[PDB]
Amino acid sequence: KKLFLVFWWHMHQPLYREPYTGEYLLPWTFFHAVKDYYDMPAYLKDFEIKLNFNLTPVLIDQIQEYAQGKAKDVFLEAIRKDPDDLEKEEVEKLIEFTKLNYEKPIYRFERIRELMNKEKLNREELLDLQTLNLLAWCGRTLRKDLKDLLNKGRNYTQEEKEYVLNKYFEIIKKTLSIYREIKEEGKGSVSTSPYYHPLIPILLNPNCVYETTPNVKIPDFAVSFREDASKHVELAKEKYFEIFGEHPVYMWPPQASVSNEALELYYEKGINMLATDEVILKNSVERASPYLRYYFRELISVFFRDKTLSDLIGFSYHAWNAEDAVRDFIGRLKKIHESVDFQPVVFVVLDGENCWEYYEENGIPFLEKLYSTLEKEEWIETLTLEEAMRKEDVKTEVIESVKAGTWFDGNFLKWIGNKEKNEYWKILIEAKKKAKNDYILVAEGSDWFWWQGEEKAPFVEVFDKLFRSFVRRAQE
């Protein structure tokens, strides 16, 4: 009697490339590529487990541009420059970026504390500021290789900074290939999402938000987004085919977001399985175990993730010692194993790149110990998405209707419903009536709405500039 454990690590970045200047206005794709996007599937070279990955097509597009050397990244240009050539604005952005990340354990360099307590920075201090920002984002693979430079902690030279930069781009150049390799070798399945990570249920039917928040105000959706929702899925299939050589049969719905109409669209586009959140299961069916494979109207398979286990990794274990955390996780899995007489399927699904920066040493002690311990428990079998879809010795159930929602409180309020987020939908609705190209699809990404209408925070004005630029470019 095994416990079937399925990790599904979701990787995504919205499009940071401004269409009039061609510049990447934030560096987050670069930094998560060098820190997480190669390294997370690279664990499979050292550990004999299965791990699965979602790659959004807009993320793939950007990884390709960085690998090809065509991304003009304005933040990275300020890192690369000799400090004598830095503009004041570039120094301010570098300071602000450091202050944003200052308390994360991956920024735990004593020299960073020294630099942020200086009234004025000279050339050698700016070089350290540049290089330590780079090295803070070092991934597991190069943390071994650059150990000498990482332990120095200070007094970096321009030659050393450039050496780090070169190694980082080598990692990026190898990134799509490792996903293809682990897929071909049967070490994991790779899924994708509708192209720019939109909220498919709202595009199909904005009235679905009322199934969970009846009091919400939404704008007048005077134009149909139903064909765009189809296009997000179809273009994603095409990009996935280019990279991996088949049409994707698994997709991760952005924000775990589903609805009856969205599940029908996924089915019509040939998707055979997806996962969503336990809250939607609880919202939709009174008696429902999350350890079964569900069939929605016998059209498409659905798994509901184990929210507790996913949130332990996403929110709890960064504050723990690595062995405390792994013992706790294994203990919980054992309690599941002993709590039922069938073989449960346990889906652990969360973002694959956003939690590690809060862990000691980028979560490498935690993941190395977790994966080492998992692979040695005879009662746990980690599965690919393909194996979880096809496994016969699993329990199964039919469901006929779900209540539309997301993994954020089961509802859509993080993307719609207040004055500021509604104004973005209004801009998009008016833009859609006049849209001439696929930049309207870029503007439909969920990320723009997530950041809008929150309390002010550094750099979020850039998301607004991007969104509004895509909206304008869509009409030309």
Ligand X SMILES: OC[C@H]1O[C@H](O[C@H]2[C@H](O)[C@@H](O)[C@@H](O[C@H]3[C@H](O)[C@@H](O)[C@@H](O[C@H]4[C@H](O)[C@@H](O)[C@@H](O[C@H]5[C@H](O)[C@@H](O)[C@@H](O[C@H]6[C@H](O)[C@@H](O)[C@@H](O)O[C@@H]6CO)O[C@@H]5CO)O[C@@H]4CO)O[C@@H]3CO)O[C@@H]2CO)[C@H](O)[C@@H](O)[C@@H]1O
Ligand Y SMILES: OC[C@H]1O[C@H](O[C@H]2[C@H](O)[C@@H](O)[C@@H](O[C@H]3[C@H](O)[C@@H](O)[C@@H](O[C@H]4[C@H](O)[C@@H](O)[C@@H](O[C@H]5[C@H](O)[C@@H](O)[C@@H](O)O[C@@H]5CO)O[C@@H]4CO)O[C@@H]3CO)O[C@@H]2CO)[C@H](O)[C@@H](O)[C@@H]1O
Among 241, 315, 342, 379, which residue sits at the site for ligand X (rule: CB under 6 A)?
315
Stretch that binds ligand X, among 49-57, 93-101, 145-153, 304-312 (CB under 6 A): 304-312
Distance of closest approach, residue 453 Cβ to ligand X, in angstroms = 15
Amino acid at 348: V
Distance of closest approach, residue 186 Cβ to ligand Y, in angstroms = 26
Cα dist from 239 to 201, 267, 312, 374, whole Å: 22, 18, 33, 33
Q: Residues near 364 by Cβ (< 8 Å), separated by ≥ 6?
A: 140, 143
Among 4, 5, 8, 14, which residue sits at the site for ligand Y (rule: CB under 6 A)?
14
Among 1, 100, 147, 396, which residue sits at the site for ligand Y (rule: CB under 6 A)?
100
Residues 394-453 that bind ligand Y (CB under 6 A): 446-447, 450
Among 354, 372, 373, 475, which residue sits at the site for ligand Y (rule: CB under 6 A)?
354
C-beta neighbour count of 39 within 10 angstroms: 25
Token pair listed for 303: 């798994």
Stretch that binds ligand X, among 71-79, 161-169, 231-239, 303-311 (CB under 6 A): 303-311
User: Is there binding between residue 103 and ligand Y (CB under 6 A)?
Assistant: no
Binding mask 382-421 for ligand X (x = CB under 6 A): -------------------------xx-------------
Distance of closest approach, residue 426 Cβ to ligand X, in angstroms = 24
For ligand Y, the closer of residues 12 and 187 by Cβ is: 12
Among 39, 353, 386, 387, which residue sits at the site for ligand Y (rule: CB under 6 A)?
353
Buried b (16+ CB within 10 A) or exposed e, 356-383: bbbbbbbbbbbbbbbbeebeebeebbbb
| Strand 3-11 relative to strand 273-277, pairing | unpaired
Please give the backbone phi and psi of residue 100, each rounded to the nearest 5 degrees, phi first.
Answer: -60, -40
The string of DSSP letters for 335-393 reads: HHHHH-SS--EEEEEEESSSSGGGSGGGGHHHHHHHHHHHTT-TTEEE--HHHHHH-SS
Stretch that binds ligand Y, among 61-69, 215-223, 297-305, 456-464 (CB under 6 A): 456-464
Identify the three-state secondary structure at position 24: strand
Residue 314 near which of ligand X, ligand Y, none (CB within 5-8 Å, type-dependent) = ligand X
Among 311, 361, 377, 438, which residue sits at the site for ligand X (rule: CB under 6 A)?
311
What is the C-alpha separation between 269 and 252, in angstroms, rounded?
14
User: Is there binding between residue 35 and ligand Y (CB under 6 A)?
Assistant: no
Among 4, 6, 9, 10, which residue sits at the site for ligand Y (rule: CB under 6 A)?
10
Among 17, 307, 337, 403, which residue sits at the site for ligand X (rule: CB under 6 A)?
307
Please give the backbone phi and psi of residue 142, each rounded to the nearest 5 degrees, phi first.
Answer: -80, -20
Q: Can you tell me which residue has the tokens 């590529």?
A: 33
User: Is there binding between residue 222 and ligand Y (CB under 6 A)?
Assistant: no
Cα dist from 128 to 124, 146, 348, whole Å: 6, 16, 39
State the number of CA atoms in the 13 A half-sphere of 322 facing the CB.
17
Residues 321-350 that bind ligand X (CB under 6 A): 350
Number of residues that bind ligand Y (CB under 6 A): 17
Residues of this chain that interact with ligand X (CB under 6 A) are 307, 310-311, 314-315, 318, 350-351, 354-355, 358, 407-408
Residues of this chain that interact with ligand Y (CB under 6 A) are 10, 12-14, 28, 32, 100, 351, 353-354, 446-447, 450, 455, 457-459
